[PDB]
Design a protein around this ligand. Structure first.
Ligand SMILES: Nc1nc2c(ncn2[C@@H]2O[C@H](COP(=O)(O)OP(=O)(O)OP(=O)(O)O)[C@@H](O)[C@H]2O)c(=O)[nH]1
Ligand SMILES: [Mg+2]
Length: 434
């Protein structure tokens, strides 16, 4: 059984959600109408993410929420209009206008009950609900504010359930708001005690990979989201194919998060090959494993040689021989600039999914024989928190834009409480890093 419910909040959450469910369907052989031919055993491993109707229709265990309707209307009328039921696609009338306070307080309060009601309808269809996967931006008023309100409400209504995040970290090369450093700090503060594990996706890292490895001069959100979905699928594959590592949401915390507040693992993916380049000699297990320690392949911009490891998981997919993985890991424990923290076990956890990696037809990514996603909890990711905090500090010293938040419910003191919590988080990393 062991079901997982995916929640996509705001434009970034919804659009990445579109790319993910398209890829999940292709991986599991589900058509855009929800029908599936072959399968054969209920006993289908993908039933953790897809419910099955009496007609044999495979329905994603997903909720899509936005405070304005334009993005979700495209889902309602697009290629996957028959995949999701209309009740799973929830929209408001007025967005949060890049304001956390509107998303969380004034506008978010109007749709929270309806969203929770729809989540409850999906939870009732579960016989062993594991928990939730939450997709959202840090920068958006909805992505930041509404997500933190929903995370707070889910911790009360489903106390025993695990909650994982896929968070879109802001970048000037891909940006929408001047106020995004405020929204980022505000959502991090209010979500920190309600999230078990969060995968940050730095828009600059994704932008750099698309330009450097996919030879895309100016990447659109489509280009960025197809790369993000490929990495998200690599992380959730274990939950959809019944492997040996990260088989349940609880295991993500057990394997990657020894210190509860320090729950931000760095994802590194390989190989990223352009579809529009005539392939070459296929990359070996050792080559794709070595690429996991190449900073250029990270989902977050940071220097892991400056940091220390708390945990490390390697998730292989495709034509991967276990002895070849063991030899690749043995080399990493030798040629070691891999320093683990004081009281952590020092081992690498390994998972192998033998299905050939799947890519979107008409996508930018080339089909490969073998791929790997490394999930490492490193103190080097604190560099990303420091960048946000510095931007927050510059504006907050002058109280620039704070009037917008104060006029939308929010107390000025919340800005100081949030920033102090970020200062304590930076100190947590610093204490572990020595
Ligand atoms: N990777 C990625 N980032 C996106 C996408 N759409 C928007 N963003 C980023 O998300 C941030 C803006 O947040 P949004 O998700 O667009 O907005 P929202 O959450 O709907 O909130 P409001 O519209 O302000 O109510 C910026 O950092 C954008 O770069 C997308 O499809 N992919
Ligand atoms: Mg929007």
């Amino acid at each position: 059984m062991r079901e997982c419910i995916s929640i996509h909040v705001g434009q970034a959450g919804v659009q990445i959600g579109n790319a993910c469910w398209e890829l999940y369907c292709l991986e599991h052989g589900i058509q855009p109408d929800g029908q599936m031919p072959s399968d054969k055993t209920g006993d289908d491993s993908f039933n953790t993410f897809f419910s099955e109707t009496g007609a044999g229709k495979h329905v994603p265990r997903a909720v899509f929420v936005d405070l304005e309707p334009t993005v979700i209307d495209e889902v309602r009328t697009g290629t996957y209009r028959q995949l999701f039921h209309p009740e799973q696609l929830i929209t408001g009338k007025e967005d949060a206008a890049n304001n956390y306070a509107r998303g969380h307080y004034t506008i978010g309060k109007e749709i929270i009950d309806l969203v929770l009601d729809r989540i409850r309808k999906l939870a009732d269809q579960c016989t062993g609900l594991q928990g939730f996967l939450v997709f959202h931006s840090f920068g958006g008023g909805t992505g930041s504010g509404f997500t933190s309100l929903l995370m707070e409400r889910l911790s009360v209504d489903y106390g025993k359930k695990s909650k994982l995040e896929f968070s879109i970290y802001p970048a000037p090369q891909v940006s929408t708001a001047v106020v995004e450093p405020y929204n980022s700090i505000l959502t991090t503060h209010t979500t920190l005690e309600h999230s078990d594990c969060a995968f940050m996706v730095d828009n600059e890292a994704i932008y750099d990979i698309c330009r450097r490895n996919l030879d895309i001069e100016r990447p659109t959100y489509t280009n960025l989201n197809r790369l993000i979905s490929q990495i998200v699928s690599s992380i959730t594959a274990s939950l959809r194919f019944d492997g040996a590592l990260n088989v349940d949401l609880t295991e993500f915390q057990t394997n990657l998060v020894p210190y509860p507040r320090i729950h931000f693992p760095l994802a590194t993916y390989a190989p990223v090959i352009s579809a529009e380049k005539a392939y070459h000699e296929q990359l070996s297990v050792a080559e794709i494993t070595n690429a996991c320690f190449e900073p250029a392949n990270q989902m977050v911009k940071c220097d892991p040689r400056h940091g220390k490891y708390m945990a490390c998981c390697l998730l292989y997919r495709g034509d991967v021989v276990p002895k070849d993985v063991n030899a690749a890991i043995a080399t990493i424990k030798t040629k070691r600039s891999i320093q683990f923290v004081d009281w952590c076990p020092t081992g690498f956890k390994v998972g192998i999914n033998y299905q050939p990696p799947t890519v979107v037809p008409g996508g930018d990514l080339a089909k490969v024989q073998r791929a790997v996603c490394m999930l490492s909890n490193t103190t080097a990711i604190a560099e990303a928190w420091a960048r946000l905090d510095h931007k927050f500090d510059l504006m907050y010293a002058k109280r620039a834009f704070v009037h917008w938040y104060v006029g939308e419910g929010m107390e000025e003191g919340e800005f100081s409480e949030a920033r102090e919590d970020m200062a304590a988080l930076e100190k947590d990393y610093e204490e572990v890093g020595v």
